[PDB]
Paper text:
Conjugative type IV secretion systems (T4SS) mediate bacterial conjugation, a process that enables the unidirectional exchange of genetic materials between a donor and a recipient bacterial cell. Bacterial conjugation is the primary means by which antibiotic resistance genes spread among bacterial populations. The recent cryo-electron microscopy (cryo-EM) structure of the conjugative Type 4 Secretion System (T4SS) encoded by the plasmid [name] revealed that the remaining VirB proteins form a large assembly organised into four sub-complexes: the outer membrane core complex (OMCC), the stalk, the arches and the inner membrane complex (IMC). Previously, we solved the cryo-electron microscopy (cryo-EM) structure of a conjugative T4SS. In this article, based on additional data, we present a more complete T4SS cryo-EM structure than that published earlier.
Further analysis employing 3D classification reveals a degree of heterogeneity in the positioning of the two extra [name]/VirB9NTD-[name]/VirB10NTD sub-complexes within the I-layer. We obtained three distinct OMCC structures, each characterised by a unique arrangement of the two extra sub-complexes in the I-layer. Aligning the structures of these three I-layer conformations using the O-layer as the reference underscores how the variability in the positions of the two extra I-layer complexes impacts the overall I-layer structure. Although the structure of each complex forming the I-layer do not change significantly (RMSD of 1.06 Å), a shift between corresponding complexes in the superposition of conformations A and B or A and C is observed. In both, this shift changes in magnitude, being maximal in the superposition involving the second extra sub-complex (that in orange in Fig. 2C i.e. complex 10 in the A versus B superposition and complex 11 in the A versus C superposition) and, intriguingly, being minimal in the complexes opposite (complex 2 in the A versus B superposition and complex 3 in the A versus C superposition). Thus, the insertion of extra complexes occurs at various positions in the I-layer, resulting in structural adjustments that propagate over the entire I-layer.
Numbering used by the authors:
A (entry chain B), D (entry chain E): 21 to 266
B (entry chain A), E (entry chain n): 150 to 153, 177 to 297
C (entry chain C): 17 to 44
F (entry chain D): 248 to 297
The structure:
């Protein structure tokens, strides 16, 4: 028999932690409405009263209001939703003291969850901003149009970066195979001033185009080996785990 | 819980007047954070384009597109724009009309514009 | 007998290193 | 229990800061009106009474109205809405004194946010006008149809300005690429008398056209590096934040 | 056992206004678990393609598909993509249009993407 | 104010023999933010239609 525990401002607000194998004691005092609040998005199925007429019931979504309406209101409520089955022991109090106005069901499992992913997200963001333990290549040569010339180009072994000054237009970046044909690669833009365009590969030969001006970039320190990406992310500090289960 | 004549029809109708309604001037909400019709987005095309089958396009902006007041950067350079066409061509036509459904920014701003695509100098298609 | 023009193929003579200076975000 | 404080102006108007974990001690009297104001845009879900008949309930949106309509009307009101829940201990005062007319709760977060935004706007609407510490170029050549020629042209590193006299038409200004192709550049008219046209770029060669007379502008000190746009605005003193959050 | 006026029609009609609805900027929910429109999935074809009869295709990716934030692998290289095509060609055409149905990461991720197949350079069909 | 911007559309193309195109205009934006949506046909340098 779980006893609701009151808040430290008033005794009329009480909290109770759920239990599948225990019923809830509610001492209903005369003349008050009691608010029972379900889980967010709890789907209502059915109730059951020890006396339909000793108590007045009204529901909206996950909200319940109960009120004494007959003498000697001492019965039980078994309200069942999709997820569980609440059990309330409705005992009417005689001296109309010690009312409850809302009852709360904190679920320790759900609170434990909510705490977890917040800490996890903080850790993930911290790990990403750590960005330590990498090598950087700068053996890059360029040929052709220099008016689309990036100011710096490099690679961290997984991504290739180009940097353009403030006054130039950001061109399109193209991937060259060994044969000489071009093709598409996904690109993303990063930086304080969006002046770095990053592509998702390291390749010996890059081609840059803008209208009818074409520029070629040679990666002259190509690493066929590269660093394998076991962690499943852009940084070796974070894994990628399967939530979906099944 | 809860308590509760008209003859000469030809010159008649050619004299039928044509009335154009009035107009009133409005004002814009906040110029620092709006982009008005007719403002120029200058993106460089990524995908090569062939009109034999209906497909989609893709282009990246090349300039910070400032606000109508010219004070706030509302679309960062390198933003990414998706657009499509259809229907192919008809004889003699040497241009195709392409429509850009959605832009997407580096920082995650997504605003849904439906604007025509133009050549380097604004001509249709 | 006539097909799509190939895009401009850049000249392969002016081959220079791209990084005149060390890039900044490397913290270098 | 949360007992409100009377206004220094009048005792009939009382304020108390909303706290979900407490009840509101409301002392109604006979023959007076009570006004309850919700937070703006609060969608009413349901309410409940310790007595459906002791009081009378009137709602127009977020305005709630409760009057006694029977003697010994000491019950509780639980109005739950989308945003929160309210608990009033309706205790009737028999001496026809200490009457209350309105209760409006304090939502500290909302008012707190609203206080700061005005400060931000006021500061911004002066930071823009500050506008100090920029380098002005003045090396500009012109050639072509000289009748259209602006009287003064210069650039700040981010925007290029053209000033036309009061007696001249405002022509169309075009951006030139390397090969000589002409392309559009967004433009904005500024200045006291709209005699200055500003373009959103800096470039070596500008082409000015009007009707069928065209003038060419060459920049003689074009800087590839420029000044980076790390603030995201026209100013180095105003930042742009992603308030959209999500 | 159990219980229970209108005149000048042509000059008027050609002067009817075209009023275009405004648009508002939303925002993406999570930029790490989301692939924006227009991102390039660059797979390699498995089966030889003949358009004489309508059938199905199959291709496998060749690069890890990173999230738009560029921080998460969302589709492991070697993921399997099924697609199909139908109807054949009309005279003079030189490309057939294929729709991709589904992608499967070896780790059991299945997502239904419907997007148009493209050539090596993103050209439609 | 001079230097304001005006946006407008056209459609339909031409037919044989015609030598001008009928372009309508829709909105005008002042520098200081005044918008009024005049709907008036556009004219060549000497007012001829289209």
């Amino acid at each position: 028999l779980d006893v609701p525990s009151s808040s430290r401002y008033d005794h009329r607000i009480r909290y109770v932690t759920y239990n599948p194998a225990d019923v809830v004691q509610v001492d209903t005092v005369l003349g008050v409405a009691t608010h029972i609040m379900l889980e967010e998005g709890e789907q209502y199925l059915t109730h059951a009263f020890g006396d339909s007429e000793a108590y007045a019931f009204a529901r909206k979504g996950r909200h319940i209001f109960i009120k004494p309406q007959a003498e000697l209101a001492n019965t039980n409520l078994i309200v069942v939703t999709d997820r569980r089955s609440y059990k309330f022991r409705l005992q009417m109090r005689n001296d109309r003291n010690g009312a409850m106005y809302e009852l709360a069901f904190r679920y320790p499992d759900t609170q434990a969850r909510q705490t977890r992913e917040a800490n996890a997200r903080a850790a993930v963001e911290a790990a990403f901003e750590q960005r330590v333990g990498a090598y950087y290549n700068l053996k890059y040569m360029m040929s052709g149009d220099k008016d689309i010339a990036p100011v710096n180009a490099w690679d961290d072994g997984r991504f290739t970066y180009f940097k353009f000054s403030a006054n130039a237009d950001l061109p399109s970046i193209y991937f060259v195979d060994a044969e000489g044909n071009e093709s598409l690669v996904p690109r993303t833009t990063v930086g304080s001033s969006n002046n770095i365009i990053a592509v998702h590969k390291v390749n010996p030969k890059w081609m840059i185009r803008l209208g009818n001006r074409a520029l070629a970039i040679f990666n002259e320190a190509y690493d066929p080996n590269g660093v394998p990406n076991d962690t499943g992310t852009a940084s070796p500090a974070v894994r990628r785990v399967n939530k979906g289960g099944n | 819980l809860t308590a509760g004549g008209g003859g000469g029809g030809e010159l008649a109708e050619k004299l039928q007047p044509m009335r154009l309604s009035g107009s009133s001037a409005g004002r814009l909400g906040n110029r620092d954070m709006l982009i008005t019709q007719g403002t120029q987005l200058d993106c460089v095309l990524e995908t090569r384009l062939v009109t034999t089958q209906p497909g989609m396009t893709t282009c990246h902006l090349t300039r910070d597109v400032y606000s109508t007041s010219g004070r706030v950067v509302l679309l960062d350079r390198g933003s990414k724009v998706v657009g499509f066409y259809q229907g192919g061509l008809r004889q003699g036509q040497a241009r195709i009309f392409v429509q850009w459904s959605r832009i997407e920014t580096p920082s995650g701003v997504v605003i849904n514009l439906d604007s025509p695509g133009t050549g380097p100098l604004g001509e249709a298609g | 007998c006539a097909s799509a023009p190939k895009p401009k193929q850049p000249s392969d003579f002016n081959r220079e290193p791209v990084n005149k200076t060390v890039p900044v975000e490397i913290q270098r």
